[PDB]
Amino acid sequence: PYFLEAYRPIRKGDIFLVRGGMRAVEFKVVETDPSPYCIVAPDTVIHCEGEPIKREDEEESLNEVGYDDIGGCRKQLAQIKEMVELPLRHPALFKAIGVKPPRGILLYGPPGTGKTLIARAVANETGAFFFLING
């Protein structure tokens, strides 16, 4: 059902994702005979037989948590991006300015509202190093 009435422009070496069946699944477009990039027509025979391969160590996984796993808190996630994104995107420039950044951000709320999730998502999406201390 994925490529039917879609004609999705694909390229050699891209990872794509399909949802359905109480599980998400990954694939990688390994080889195109009109190399490298094309549009999947009904002409294309699609080889789906073989071994599921290993990852490269710098392939960013899709089971990680990003900003699309969080719902219902648009405003607060905007505030945390404004506080945090600039001092971690541009450390050298921001050191060269001479302004102090924030250094202590206390998230609080009732139990079960997704605070560990928000911190994990900001860490994955900025790409900073992340160390977790548990109480």
Next chain:
Amino acid sequence: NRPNRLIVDEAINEDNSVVSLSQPKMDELQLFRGDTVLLKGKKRREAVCIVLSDDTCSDEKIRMNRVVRNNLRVRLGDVISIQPCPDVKYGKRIHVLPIDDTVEGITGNLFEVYLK
């Protein structure tokens, strides 16, 4: 018993080369508010400044900025001799150099932004 040995107090004016004096001390000391004075300090280090007037300034005290105060090796409550010197001429070549700690962020120009 000389009227030129003076003692530093806190500064009110914001300039880096302006000292202040009260008017009877200037009139005794033969100074006008356009003069160019010479100031001696500890470890034989001296400085040159433009004097102006004040009424909130006392006679036993001179008011100077922190930049002049640190170029004389003087702290608050120390002794400094002042003397008029119209022996100051103009210049031809003046060679300046930044100090290494304050210039670690910016690179590029320094003449037109700062000194101009």
